Design a protein around this ligand. Structure first.
Ligand SMILES: Nc1ncnc2c1ncn2[C@@H]1O[C@H](COP(=O)(O)OP(=O)(O)NP(=O)(O)O)[C@@H](O)[C@H]1O
Ligand SMILES: [Mg+2]
Ligand SMILES: [Mg+2]
Ligand SMILES: [Mg+2]
Lengths: 295, 299
């Protein structure tokens, strides 16, 4: 009951990849409206799981800080080949905040840009949490901007639920640098699970990434980072130039033990997030920066 | 064919069509302009600054010759994009058109291969690994997906430059942890393994997980979230086949590859003398059955 995308959506060009498959800029054939399309090989036995995932993705993406999910499709392939799942969502033209910080001189964003982006993240997270959804994959590549300097979350955890063989697309662990300590199983933490507060740790790491251009432990092998995170104290900003408010917000996101980590609503009331005077001009500064870099 | 340089591929190799998706960039069918020889090309975006790193890694490349069980690695190229724009790294490798062992087992009834097929494929894997190992090179990614077939039923290891592991380090891929299922305990850092060592015997563990994958169509723990499996691999005892139909030789072989402590794991040569691998009476028939199966599949 998932259809071929032919005549409905079509691929335009790659915008990025990693993990598994790639993401294209895509187009709704009949209106010319853009979309992002995630394309990845799947077996036909995955189909039942996909319909559950897409259903969840659509239901929870109707908030201004989440990229809205449009639909999923399966482009059947000739005998022998695997069919391609196409996952179709809102196109975010300005790209990821990881890209942003990369294309910015100094690999560092102004403090008030960081406060604005982090609030937008928290609001998106707030929406998901109240609906009992853990994002579980927060990081710079999963935070996107529109042409109009709007901020949107993408790729919140759906699945795995189904007591099935996990499909290839879900068998890859991914970059670990944004993962909370409690999420990484060890002797004392054998069943290590997500908690909504797991996303808040990730938002703190994303904030450091905006400040320094890379997450903590970036000079280490990913596997070794996996080992260190549950053992290390909370990461810290390296420069002292930042405001007392910024330091305190980082401290809040990065509370080692998640039991005393603040909730999403609490961080939204944190002075660094809550009190933002130059908002309007931030937007404009962001808007203008985006244009400069496209060109 | 040059394995120490890094030229633009213009007028040398050209892309003709996307053939599939490897780890993690796209794999094209390509041909060498001047000979018309087919090749698989793995393509990856890289930043200007990554290109100095790439140079260092090419210097670290170890040299080894062709071998009938290794898809030949032809070398690397950087295709330049206009300034500002990210370039592409091209990794060129011998083309094999008959799919992977994973394709092979997934396209059977019951997702399972005959024991004499597994013995045959496993030996070919081990032979390729011996050649690598004797030249001081670790493959690092032994698994069904990375074991390919030709139209002639030749078994060959994927080699997009295993000495340098470029297809796993460039364009941020170095930040990824991939799939854990075929990993040896020693590559997984855990409370008892602060620094995850890769050893040549790591491949032998993975060859053992691959024989299980041939026998059951999937690696152990395939039902777990990869994070949960990552934790379990260093802690569980050696995995084993589910069914009991299998011969004692086959059970013994799996046991031989899957020693938890790599220091106590056999070497490639030792494992090539395992009776499961060493004694293959129906060898020629097997290769026939294989050649045939391949053909009917193209049809
Ligand atoms: N809706 C979108 N609009 C514009 N760009 C996008 C969109 N979704 C993803 N991208 C970009 O495409 C590139 C590939 O993203 P993706 O395949 O999701 O990998 P990832 O985010 O780095 N890891 P993961 O989400 O855990 O699989 C990233 O740079 C994304 O920011
Ligand atoms: Mg939305
Ligand atoms: Mg993304
Ligand atoms: Mg993503």
């Amino acid at each position: 009951s998932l259809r071929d995308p032919a005549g409905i959506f079509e691929l335009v060009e790659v915008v990025g990849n990693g993990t598994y498959g790639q993401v294209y800029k895509g187009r709704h054939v009949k209106t010319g409206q853009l979309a992002a399309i995630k394309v990845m090989d799947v077996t036909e036995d995955e189909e039942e799981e996909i319909k559950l995932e897409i259903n969840m993705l659509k239901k929870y993406s109707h908030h201004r800080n989440i990229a809205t999910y449009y639909g999923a499709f399966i482009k059947k392939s000739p005998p022998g080949h695997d069919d391609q799942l196409w996952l179709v969502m809102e196109f975010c033209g300005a790209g990821s905040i990881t890209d942003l910080v990369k294309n910015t001189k100094g690999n560092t964003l102004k403090e008030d840009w960081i406060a604005y982006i982090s609030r937008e993240i928290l609001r998106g997270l707030a929406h998901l949490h109240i609906h009992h959804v853990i994002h579980r994959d927060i990081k710079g590549q999963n935070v996107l901007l529109t042409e109009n300097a709007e901020v949107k979350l993408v790729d919140f955890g759906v699945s795995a639920q189904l007591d099935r063989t996990v499909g290839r697309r879900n068998t890859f662990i991914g970059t670990p640098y944004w993962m909370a300590p409690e999420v990484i199983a060890c002797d004392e933490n054998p069943d290590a699970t997500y908690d909504y507060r797991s996303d808040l740790w990730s938002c703190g790491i994303t904030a450091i990434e905006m400040a320094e251009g890379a997450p903590p432990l970036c000079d280490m092998h990913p596997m070794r980072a996996l080992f260190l995170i549950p053992r290390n104290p909370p990461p810290r900003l390296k420069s002292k130039k930042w405001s007392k408010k910024f330091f305190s917000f980082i401290e809040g996101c990065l509370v080692k033990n998640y039991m005393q980590r603040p909730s999403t609503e609490q961080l939204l009331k944190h002075p660094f997030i809550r009190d933002q005077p130059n908002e309007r001009q931030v937007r404009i500064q962001l808007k203008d920066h985006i244009d400069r870099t496209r060109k």
